[PDB]
Design a protein around this ligand. Structure first.
Ligand SMILES: Nc1ncnc2c1ncn2[C@@H]1O[C@H](COP(=O)(O)OP(=O)(O)OP(=O)(O)O)[C@@H](O)[C@H]1O
Ligand SMILES: Nc1ncnc2c1ncn2[C@@H]1O[C@H](COP(=O)(O)OP(=O)(O)OP(=O)(O)O)[C@@H](O)[C@H]1O
Ligand SMILES: C#Cc1ccc(Nc2c(C(=O)NOCCO)ccc(F)c2F)c(F)c1
Ligand SMILES: C#Cc1ccc(Nc2c(C(=O)NOCCO)ccc(F)c2F)c(F)c1
Ligand SMILES: [Mg+2]
Ligand SMILES: [Mg+2]
Lengths: 289, 289
């Protein structure tokens, strides 16, 4: 069925940031609860046709690790992307409440991210481009899915920050970046969720004991590309997880682990095995099910 | 009269970017054409009262060089700032069409900016914080006014980028910045409008002759704080304008010119004297009057 502006009805507001507003909506003719993302864009008719036509490939994006897509269209000054409503929200949202996402669970996250990235690369020849806790979605059925990946060249162009950056050193420095940049993003995301806060600058010997000031735009980006990469605090995380993130946060794109190598890493092998009630942990900490 | 959401009616859309949408609207009970800025904010009732109460000082901001303020209020997920409709739009908008704003005119711009900054500092003890071509507004009566200055501490907090930066070296580096940061912003704005493009990185010897690739976030900010400041191309601009911007773009906050010193600089003295049809030049280049 073809999606249309007058066929929708706002329920609530799921969040916003840097270009998009997403509402929990209801598709009147189908009865389906949906998440609708609106991106306000002052765009000429000809090249918003391109964006809509380019977003049609999302119909061919089927994977348990990728958010379902229903439709995309343009309506008076906004393009609409209609996707599956994830009732658990984003990992950045569950982190606020959790305070800290346990290593066991983060392993189930890593698996999903690595499988999601892999699907997009192998079957669609695209990198994600914006991997961060807010672009990773969860639900009550325990599914962990990626959204907001780069399907549309022209939409990337049309929008082209803040004070938190998950961009790789090579991407911050120039145009010489590619799929390996997503590994850094995942790597850094996993450290953040582990310790409970954005891991740059690293916490001091006192803050380390405490848990267990805001940085300026240049101070932050300078730290990323020049000062040694963030590490997982030792002792309280397994040597398996540590090696995983360390291999992820290698500054050099070519020295850095890839999806292939990460898929067969000790931590993932260990995480595939483990019997964990994700849905249980998720709903119990966010008060849902 | 007290401003209200149901009392307004959308005419057109004037623009958007990084938090705000501004519509040309009509205030039904007064008949006044207005510019209404909406800032979408997920904010607790208690601290959106603060923002609204803090924006009331804008009622006491009266100056020919500051955009008129009518009212501010909150309405279902957005705070509204209602200001004078400037029919000429922003300097960044007139630059697109002009291609280059003549030195003579930029002198009338400088005067307004320096008088606008001065008013805000002396009479209200506030710095602007976001001086750039888009925050400088013009109209058909030839008025040149500033908007989007920092009246509200809590609103600054609530919003706290892109790929063009007008932030001073000291502000990009830390919290050790103040009113002198606005001078850099003005300084850099004036170079941009003069030559026709954002002046970092500087144009090469070939591009200089031609007129008369996009930079990554770190490459750009690294250039600002480390590499020598931008200069006005010699020969085709007066020695008076050159010294003005040079004195504005001194990397050191304390070595940099202030509002006092700039007010009595040769270029402003010269610009105060000159008889220029701004309204004429403006309307003629943007097709209005
Ligand atoms: N399909 C969805 N299901 C449930 N919640 C969603 C969905 N899509 C987005 N959200 C929620 O809406 C919020 C806003 O997402 P949006 O993509 O607009 O910005 P963001 O990813 O949070 O941050 P940024 O703008 O910095 O990328 C997310 O944090 C998420 O909690
Ligand atoms: N009072 C006004 N009168 C006429 N036009 C306006 C007025 N206020 C804003 N505009 C127009 O709306 C546009 C959007 O302004 P807004 O403050 O939302 O973002 P911006 O200043 O353009 O860019 P940024 O978001 O990067 O600061 C401006 O470029 C300007 O042309
Ligand atoms: C399932 C699904 C799904 C995939 C992509 C986007 N959106 C985007 C975004 C995007 O949403 N970026 O983040 C917006 C705010 O940071 C950017 C470029 C692009 F081509 C897209 F298709 C989406 F919505 C949903
Ligand atoms: C006349 C007038 C006038 C003065 C200030 C703001 N707006 C702001 C902004 C603002 O608009 N920033 O830019 C928004 C997008 O970059 C930020 C902080 C603050 F306290 C304000 F009052 C405005 F609207 C109009
Ligand atoms: Mg997102
Ligand atoms: Mg503005």
């Amino acid at each position: 069925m073809e999606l249309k502006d007058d066929d929708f009805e706002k329920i609530s507001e799921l969040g916003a940031g840097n270009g998009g507003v997403v509402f929990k909506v209801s598709h009147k003719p189908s009865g389906l609860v949906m998440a609708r993302k609106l991106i306000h864009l002052e765009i000429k008719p000809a090249i918003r046709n391109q964006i809509i036509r380019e977003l049609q490939v999302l119909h061919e994006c089927n994977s348990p690790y990728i958010v379902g897509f229903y439709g995309a269209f343009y309506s008076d000054g906004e393009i609409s992307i209609c996707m599956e409503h994830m009732d658990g929200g984003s990992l950045d949202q569950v982190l606020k409440k959790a305070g800290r996402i346990p290593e066991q669970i983060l392993g189930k996250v890593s698996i999903a991210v690595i499988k999601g990235l892999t699907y997009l690369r192998e079957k669609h020849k695209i990198m994600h481009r914006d991997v961060k806790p807010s672009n990773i979605l969860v639900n009550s059925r325990g599914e962990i899915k990626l959204c907001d990946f780069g399907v549309s060249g022209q939409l990337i162009d049309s929008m082209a920050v803040g004070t938190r950056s998950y961009m790789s050193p090579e991407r911050l420095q120039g145009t010489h970046y590619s799929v390996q940049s997503d590994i850094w993003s995942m790597g850094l995301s996993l450290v953040e969720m582990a310790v409970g806060r954005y891991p740059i600058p690293p916490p001091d010997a006192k803050e380390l004991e405490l848990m267990f000031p805001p940085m300026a735009i240049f101070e932050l980006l300078d730290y990323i590309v020049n000062e040694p990469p963030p590490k997982l605090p030792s002792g309280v995380f397994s040597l398996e997880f540590q090696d995983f993130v360390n291999k992820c946060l290698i500054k050099n794109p070519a020295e850095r682990a890839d999806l292939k190598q990460l898929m067969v890493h000790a931590f993932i092998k260990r995480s595939d095995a483990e019997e964990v009630d994700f849905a249980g942990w998720l709903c119990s900490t966010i008060g849902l099910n």
